[PDB]
Design a binder for this molecule. Sequence first.
Ligand SMILES: [Zn+2]
Ligand SMILES: [Zn+2]
Ligand SMILES: [Zn+2]
Ligand SMILES: [Zn+2]
Lengths: 195, 198, 198, 198
Amino acid sequence: SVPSQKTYQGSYGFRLGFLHSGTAKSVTCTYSPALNKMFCQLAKTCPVQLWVDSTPPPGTRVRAMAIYKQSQHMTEVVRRCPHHERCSDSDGLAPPQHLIRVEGNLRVEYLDDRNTFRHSVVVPYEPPEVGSDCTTIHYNYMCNSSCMGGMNRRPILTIITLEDSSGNLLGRNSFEVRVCACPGRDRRTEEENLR
Amino acid sequence: SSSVPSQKTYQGSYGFRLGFLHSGTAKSVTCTYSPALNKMFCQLAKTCPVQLWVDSTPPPGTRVRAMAIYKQSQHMTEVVRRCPHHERCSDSDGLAPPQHLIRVEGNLRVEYLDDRNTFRHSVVVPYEPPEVGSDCTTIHYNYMCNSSCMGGMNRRPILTIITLEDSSGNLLGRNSFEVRVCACPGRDRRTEEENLRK
Amino acid sequence: SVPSQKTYQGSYGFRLGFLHSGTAKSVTCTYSPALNKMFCQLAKTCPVQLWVDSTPPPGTRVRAMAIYKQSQHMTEVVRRCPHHERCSDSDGLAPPQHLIRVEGNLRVEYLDDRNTFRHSVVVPYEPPEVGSDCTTIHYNYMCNSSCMGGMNRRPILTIITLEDSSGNLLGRNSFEVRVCACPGRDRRTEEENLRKKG
Amino acid sequence: SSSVPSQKTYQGSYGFRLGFLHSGTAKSVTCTYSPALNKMFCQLAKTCPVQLWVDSTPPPGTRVRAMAIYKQSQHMTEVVRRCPHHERCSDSDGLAPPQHLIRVEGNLRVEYLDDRNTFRHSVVVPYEPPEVGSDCTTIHYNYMCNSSCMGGMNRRPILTIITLEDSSGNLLGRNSFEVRVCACPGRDRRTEEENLRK
DNA sequence: CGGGCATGCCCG
DNA sequence: CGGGCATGCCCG
DNA sequence: CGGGCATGCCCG
DNA sequence: CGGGCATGCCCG
Ligand SMILES: [Zn+2]
Ligand SMILES: [Zn+2]
Ligand SMILES: [Zn+2]
Ligand SMILES: [Zn+2]
């Protein structure tokens, strides 16, 4: 199977936002709007903002899941490589096999889907803090796109889904990710190549 | 890695809550509480008064335990302990094991627990009701490393969890607060308060 | 942990020889006499000649084992990285964790030493072909020097020993190995680096 | 307390002296030397190249030793060692004792000593003559605590004493220089040199 | 690396 | 924060 | 192959 | 970080 990637802003006008951090060679996380693509370093903080037109109900949850972008790879589960799965860099909460973690949220929940075997990470939705217009989740990606026996230089998309407390769809957005050593260098390269 | 202690306020059947003095924000005040942040700022080894306020009186045998945990969910499963330097300074008061971060001062009935399963440290004293003409019981805590101590807290923020417990360790009430141990509590309190809006 | 790497011709005058090869950028296997170092691609045939002054007894065996060259890594067992171990690329005889295999020899034995945990591969010694001067063994190396989780960019030596049928040592020689994508380029580079010493 | 090695610079009969790299004062330069102060400023664990210059070649078996002492008369008898945090960090190069402040890198012949009488730490290497095309021999030192380290140097300045010694440890030559290990060597050298002037 | 600050001390 | 500095380090 | 790039990572 | 290079892989 393949999880849906279709954008769905939904009744709450769900949108993503990203920080605008530029293309210095080793910027930790930066986002290319031309490419709708986050470029980020392994294990570093990757902020993703949730913007809504109105507040979803209490019990609302926010899930992230990686899939391969290329059609020929889409049915293959995205996992960490054999090396990084064994590095023992757990924060005590995340399963060692999961590519995507959330940092700074003790209510984080990881799922290994019993039917599709896909990995995902979910947290409760919380409204923006006073004086803030969005809710920010800190994600970490735990292998480079280049990892042999893992993503193996294949691009991924992250799919962010807003769900009710039972798992019903409320909203969906997505972005491509490249996890790399020098996000600024690589962003500039793919955009210049775009031009 | 260690399972994570709850930090949720639980007044329980004795209406248990905390109180803190009003000490101001002079640059190097020894201890000061920020109601806005629910955060104590204090100097290493200096007296940190924490008031226990109840509605009904807990039965004799009730104990009051304090434990530190890392605030950041990503360090929360790691035991909070003193740094290698201060563990070796010989500044024990006669009862506190040297690796323990939190001490209680002035109480001969104090006990220190190095837990067998979780390895977490805690310090416990019998609950005593307030003096006649007092509305609360005050415990004097000390924190024996700076938040900045390398190889200890290592600039990571902590929470202190205060639990009311029965003589067997069962939960009766709980409250918590963040703590920064630092050189200039008044200065840092002001900085962090200013950060709320910046 | 570390087996001796000390060159020992022993009573049979045991030496290693190596085929002439170029430094064509991606030549499959090339030996640098200057460096005493083989440069080869992953899973490619690597010829190693065995030379003796006198014939060892029947039942003699030829063993090959990799160790890290650098002294701070010497006690760590050289093995294949987690990815390559799991690639199901075995020849049918080599256990998948073994770095060094022998090609074209059904009398090969692979040993995972129960005491030292080191891997080695052994074949019976067969004297040179009638007329010929040496015996050639074909080795393969199943990870790049670069493999993360495996050699991780650290230089190794291959130690070749002649042993009697009970495992008593008769002779010993060695050579450095880099397993890499472009053995010709890299031999060229390392030889250029040499000349700049100084 | 420990008796105090001489720091008195003298070239002796082989004309022994040190050269430093004049790397300027960029804020975070890894290592830099002030001639006006005779003082090296360097970051923790970074390469500190020290050149050995001689007018004539010393004999086979000549060695070169480095040792730190406190510069301040009131602290001179105290052994200089790493702080408890850094001693316990996972930063070994597989050779240096974890308590030793000064290491040499890039040399398997390095030897570390705790003095039988003074318990003072030193690091020693064989003297090698300059490489072809060079007029000096360069040693790469590393300093493994900051001058500021609590429980270690604790903001007290040190000298490093470099001695040229015969194979028996008799002194052939000596040169000393002040060291500050710090996060911003260029900043702090520029500051200290500013502070010379009226 | 290093601007801008975090965070120690008062013979800092 | 009382003013002034010594002195470490995140993240671009 | 030889030329050149993708992409991790060390130096200051 | 920016400069450079290690080191896999691809292109024509
Ligand atoms: Zn990986
Ligand atoms: Zn401490
Ligand atoms: Zn491999
Ligand atoms: Zn130190």
